[PDB]
Amino acid sequence: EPCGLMNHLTAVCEVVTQFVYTASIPALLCNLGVTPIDGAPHRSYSECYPVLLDGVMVGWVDK
Amino acid sequence: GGLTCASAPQGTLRILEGPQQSLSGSPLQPIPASPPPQIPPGLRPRFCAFG
Question: Are B12 and A33 in contact (CB < 8 Å)?
Fold first, then answer.
């Protein structure tokens, strides 16, 4: 009955349990080519990617 | 200070940092393969048959 439901981690696998401040990461992305979500993406949005940082939509990238 | 509407812009400059790729593009550096098991030297017949 529990075959395939009660799975086990591999020996190398590990669960992320550390918590960090990600206040610097969206400004880092905008220092790269990620346009902010208010600003114009300088290309068609059909030629762009939506950027998500932890369930926060940061912006748009030229593909 | 009337702040009139000016004309449409000609284009767009966009400044952003470029990554350095003098490091990557090199030949790959994989993890070295562990050796296959080799027979130990100095293996002798220790057991001799009784009588």
Answer: no
Residue labelled with tokens 């990557």: B24
Q: Do B16 and A33 touch (CB under 8 A)?
A: yes
| Rounded alpha-carbon distances, angstroms, from residue B43 to A15, A42, B40, B47, B48 | 46, 74, 7, 12, 14
Q: What is the resolution of this structure in A?
A: 2.7
CA distance B25 to B42: 47
A32/A58 Cα distance (integer angstroms): 12
Q: A50 vs A47, A53, A57, B9, CA distance in Å?
A: 10, 10, 7, 26
Per CB-CB distance under 8 Å, the chain A contacts of B12 are 42
d(CA A31, CA B15): 8
Technique used by the depositors: cryo-EM
